Design a protein around this ligand. Structure first.
Ligand SMILES: *[C@@]1(=O)C(=O)[N]C2=[C][C]=[C][C]=C21
Ligand SMILES: *[C@@]1(=O)C(=O)[N]C2=[C][C]=[C][C]=C21
Ligand SMILES: [Cl-]
Ligand SMILES: [Cl-]
Lengths: 187, 187
């Protein structure tokens, strides 16, 4: 049976950090749902790329649970995720069922806001470190991708391929990740 | 005065190869127009990400010329670009005025279709090499990014940041490219 991914898309999301994981996961045969935080309408990302979600978050939640919940970064996107009660509920449920949670760049600061994964080793964008580390509830890492059990984090647009391939490896295994990677022409 | 980029967006375009250059160029202060080949409606990219263009190609052409014309890859996207008379006209005009043309992955095969830049050194996705080299009208390179004068080409999703930063360097200079690069957390 195919693995399933929920990508939560908020206004101000970093479009590269949204598109790279969606695309790479789909290359891996993962069924990906791009879910709009605010509803079904197109979402204006951080650098003004407009993406049409597959579904509203409200509707995608009804088809859960998912093998991974993915939080893109972008400062304003992450703030919107952090302020959302629906996101809190989704992440709590995922944590409680021991499902994977993946967040990149400023995205991991939503884990802090929703009290998810405390005690984990995590990374973030360098500019988001102080926010993430407020209260010392996590241990900080400078690894490009950090995976501490079911909390998987990464640093920035330039680590998005590594982040995506780590999700693929977690869900579908090393060999599938290697096969998906080769045609991408990564360094 | 700000430089201006036309990104031509066709059904089946590789969404990573579309979004990374748009985003990176906007980070560099370039005014980017995402122009829909088929008109103003949302475009279904290769891995099913749906992007809403800023304008139709017909409308964006009226605001030309641009400092760079950018052709994303994706096999089906590149085929749509290759079959388009409007694209032919845009690229001929750009070549004739000695403006930059940038293409990635299968994207450069549209240069072949429209007889653009013959004699240039070029790269493509490895799987697109035979198509590009039909007739020996270019010289092939395995460099991740190749720039031969005003023809700038690159290989794949995994070279999209390098491709984008090379466009930035060409238009705005080395120092701006370096400043835009640093916060991306590239290897
Ligand atoms: C990233 O997308 C984020 O969340 N915060 C940030 C700062 C600089 C570059 C990229 C990002
Ligand atoms: C790329 O986007 C293209 O145009 N052709 C191709 C083949 C494999 C991976 C990426 C690409
Ligand atoms: Cl941001
Ligand atoms: Cl393709």
């Amino acid at each position: 049976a195919s693995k399933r991914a929920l990508v939560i898309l908020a206004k101000g999301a970093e479009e590269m950090e949204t598109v790279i994981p969606v695309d790479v996961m789909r290359r891996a045969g993962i069924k990906v749902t791009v879910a709009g935080l605010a509803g079904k309408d197109p979402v204006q990302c951080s650098r003004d790329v407009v993406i049409c979600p597959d579904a509203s978050l409200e509707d995608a939640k009804k088809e859960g649970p998912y093998d991974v919940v993915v939080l893109p970064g972008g400062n304003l996107g992450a703030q919107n995720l952090s302020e959302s009660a629906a996101v809190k509920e989704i992440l709590k449920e995922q944590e409680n069922r021991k499902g994977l949670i993946a967040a990149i760049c400023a995205g991991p600061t939503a884990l802090l806001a929703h009290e998810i994964g405390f005690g984990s080793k995590v990374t973030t964008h360098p500019l988001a470190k102080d926010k993430m580390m407020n209260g010392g509830h996590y241990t900080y890492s400078e690894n490009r991708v950090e995976k501490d059990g079911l909390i998987l984090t990464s640093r920035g647009p330039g680590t998005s391929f590594e982040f995506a391939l780590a999700i693929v490896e977690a869900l579908n295994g090393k060999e599938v990740a290697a096969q998906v990677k080769a045609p991408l022409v990564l360094k």
